[PDB]
């Protein structure tokens, strides 16, 4: 989200625009600061996915592992589990040449203006392309013997070597028997059914979408309507007096409204920097837990880790770490 | 509009059907009114003002600006649009529609390279103007074989070496 | 240093208003009628003042204006202005008359001085003068054969011509500013504050570069609201006809510019930040150069059209039903808090007379009131002379 | 700075058999120089760039069944059964390129 | 120093040569003046305390 100040403050009224002129340095530092924030975030997205794919898919064929029923197949473009955690998450956004007009037929990133949400650098089919080639490289790259100069091995044998590794049950158990396969598929089945509501991670996901949607729309609803001493969106708009004191109440509303906008910009720098920390963590979770196994505890959550899958969640990745549980 | 004791700027529509109907506004949890009443007697529900959330695609190397609109519209805009207030402000200066509307030719034009200056959803927009490339991804996909054998993509050349990242360690004190 | 700065500037791409002065009519031997544009009747609003591009075409080849088929080398000519606080029409009805004290900026001496003076302009009454018969426009002139001879320029030539159309009365000042003769492009500017009227020129401080600097503050404290361009015509003979460089007037307004100052302090580049989003972005960064990317510039908000006002409908009912009483039993309808279509009511009847006091019939339909009283009765048209305020 | 200490103790002393952090490729060397306010790394990574798709197994067997595969990289190609794997190709008869695990399915070679 | 309508505390030096030279200060992008003018007629560029 980028705010278009000098027309957020003010609503577009010429006297209030001149009183912004007086503050023509601060607005430049606002939009300068947010454009810097988006380039840092965008380089986190770009550097993240350039540290995602690199090499080399299987490719995506409807049979991954025999017989491991994988929901992570693309049906055809945003696979099925990714469809579950995009349908169950409540987003009132976005508009890209159908949602602006679709809201015009009736969130308001395109109506206050004001604030304005930029698109996330990548179309959904293409983030789906990164993580789908990543699902292709799960089997062969999870072998390893080096990251990344390999391979094309079927997914079943990838989980008998990933399972041979740290759940160090050697070959006689996985030979006699499998089904494991039905226990693996049973595990992924309960991983299909359970998203809502008592299954955070998922409440963390809606804590994120409700976080940035809350900050954006709800903080921008606190910023406007109302803040100031007399604050009917222009202090003494046209309809009430004075003309002399109009600049006084309006300058209250601009100092306050722009100051709280500058608090929003400081907040975007905070969650941008922490988002880049967590994105570097995600790159550390893809290069360790997703390619390799990774012979380490949680991070690769709760048990001797076996497989892990990546799907694009709202604003973030999302992992489906398949761990062992002795019992 | 300009109603009884209330000012405002809205787009009235004949909507349905939520209100009090005896006193004659309806708010939505804030100071705003969303928005019918007053007309006699229907439901002219109002909305906020229309704003075109414009931008600029400079490109200082070839000095070629290219004005992009946010998310609307290939159909609703007009060139040097006379229904709207601020270019900004004095003077202004239509192809989409993957993201929004742009005042810059041309249609895709695939696919390169990808790099900056890297506009929104996926117009990758090189220069020279000449927007909208979609340059992804593309990994060298080894194909999966069927039987006891399984293909693998080993390389041939070393080609070492990069400079890499700064890690900041301190402040100035 | 470079910087963003908020001050009075013309806007990028403004074509401004162009003015041209011409040789007058002439035979081979004798100057005749002056030849001018309609500038004197075109009174402009001063607003924040203006800047003027002078002499830009000097050196190039152009037409003589009064004889379009004749070309000549273009020479710089200086503009003249009339400015003031109150305007109207001359006795014969033509526009362009300035009332009370008027500021006149009038070059003279074949372009070797500027005169600035503040006087009442009394229109003179001889033939072709502004209070006389056969008036078309006032103007100034000089006669180069006698006014611009080497070593003996007539300083007052234009002033004298002006004095033929107006008597100058109660002048509070008359200042002169010398000008060195050349064909170099220059800029002139004028603004006003409570301190008076400020004159700007590139000539003294940046002759070769064009930046304008203040060279005078005139004690004119009555706010200037209006100006016109005083037409000049050059009383040459046919064989002496020259082409005179058009000049261009551009209005000033408060704008924020990027200003690029050279090492020597002068401004050789600027950006009009509000011109478009690209320039906007260019200004952000407090630099001429803005790094290549996407930069968000603000809306584009739609224009108000169809301003709905809600408050209804005034009840003229009992007037139409029954017998209008006699004048001495007049019935009274009172109106508080309602909307009226009165031209509606007066479209039912045939209306024979409509007079108002302290209002007009046009006005009484339009305005809003806190109270409207309608009294009606039977009354014969024969007795109109008795129904009077 | 604690990250930099984690990058010096992992990527600079040891190798570190892990992906980026030690940026972009199977990491080889890394060098440290003092930058303004921080350190600065010159991570020397591998970059493969000429990929040739060849064929596995997965190992070998015979009439008797002890296996091979792998020390540590795959296969066991064909022509005839050769083993320069990651990165370049291809070795001789193995003789030290082979642990001997249990047999698996797709019998005798040995998948 | 204490110049015309401006106060301040500075170390004047005969510096070169940047200014306007017709009106008599020079600022550097802020309220401060860096700083020559006024002397008659040279370049006494000032500094902070
Ligand atoms: C999401 C999905 O398709 N799940 C299927 C399930 O319906 C089916 O019962 C099972 C047996 O083959 O395979 C898997
Ligand atoms: C359900 C509803 O709102 N229907 C409305 C109707 O009442 C109205 O008469 C018509 C004319 O605009 O538009 C539609
Ligand atoms: C046509 C055919 O024989 N396809 C087989 C398939 O049935 C088997 O599941 C797969 C795994 O080895 O190998 C191949
Ligand atoms: C046969 C072969 O792979 N030759 C490569 C060549 O293509 C590449 O240009 C060069 C630069 O790294 O390295 C070597
Ligand atoms: C002859 C003439 O123009 N007189 C005007 C007068 O009409 C005007 O009321 C007054 C106030 O500005 O200025 C003078
Ligand atoms: C004291 C006196 O008579 N002053 C008059 C003045 O009122 C008039 O406006 C002016 C213009 O002719 O002439 C003089
Ligand atoms: C041009 C010249 O030789 N002398 C004039 C002089 O007559 C005049 O008094 C002075 C003030 O404008 O300007 C100079
Ligand atoms: C400097 C000088 O003496 N005269 C200049 C000349 O250089 C230029 O060509 C022309 C302006 O367009 O006239 C003037
Ligand atoms: C730090 C900086 O920008 N210095 C510039 C310098 O490079 C340039 O040569 C000089 C001439 O205009 O102006 C100043
Ligand atoms: C290039 C420069 O600044 N030179 C100055 C000179 O002008 C001045 O006369 C001298 C005396 O202080 O100091 C030195």
Numbering used by the authors:
A (entry chain C): 802 to 877, 886 to 915, 924 to 1144
B (entry chain B): 606 to 698, 710 to 744, 757 to 801
C (entry chain B): 67 to 377, 381 to 458
D (entry chain B): 1096 to 1206
E (entry chain A): 606 to 654
Give sentences from the paper:
For the MERS-CoV S protein, we also mutated the S2 cleavage site to enhance the stability. The cleaved form of the MERS-CoV S ectodomain was confirmed by SDS–polyacrylamide gel electrophoresis (SDS–PAGE), and further N-terminal sequencing revealed that the S ectodomain protein was cleaved after residue R748, three residues ahead of the S2 cleavage site. For MERS-CoV S trimer, two classes were found with one or two of the three S1 RBDs in the S trimer in the ‘standing' state. Aside from the RBD, the rest of the S1/S2 protein remained the same as in the trimer. To improve the resolution in the rest of the protein, we combined the data from both classes and determined the structure of MERS-CoV S ectodomain trimer with three-fold symmetry imposed at a resolution of 3.7 Å. An atomic model of the cleaved MERS-CoV S1/S2 trimer was built de novo using the 3.7 Å map, except for the flexible regions of S1 CTD and part of S1 NTD, which were fitted by crystal structures. The final model includes residues 18–1,206, with several small breaks due to the poor densities. The MERS-CoV S ectodomain is a 140 Å long trimer with a triangular cross-section varying in diameter from 50 Å, at the membrane proximal base, to 140 × 130 Å at the membrane distal head, resembling a blooming flower. In the cryo-EM reconstruction, we observed the density for 10 N-linked glycans in MERS-CoV S protein and 14 N-linked glycans in SARS-CoV S protein.
The key determinant of host specificity is the envelope-located trimeric spike (S) glycoprotein, which can be further cleaved by host proteases into an N-terminal S1 subunit and a membrane-bound C-terminal S2 region. In the S1 subunit, the receptor binding domain (RBD, also called the C terminal domain, CTD) is localized in the C-terminal region, spanning ∼200 amino acids, and structural studies have revealed that the RBD consists of two subdomains: the core and external subdomains. For both MERS-CoV and SARS-CoV S proteins, the S2 subunit is mainly composed of α-helices and forms the stem region of the S protein. Here we present high-resolution structures of the trimeric MERS-CoV and SARS-CoV S proteins in its pre-fusion conformation by single particle cryo-electron microscopy (cryo-EM).
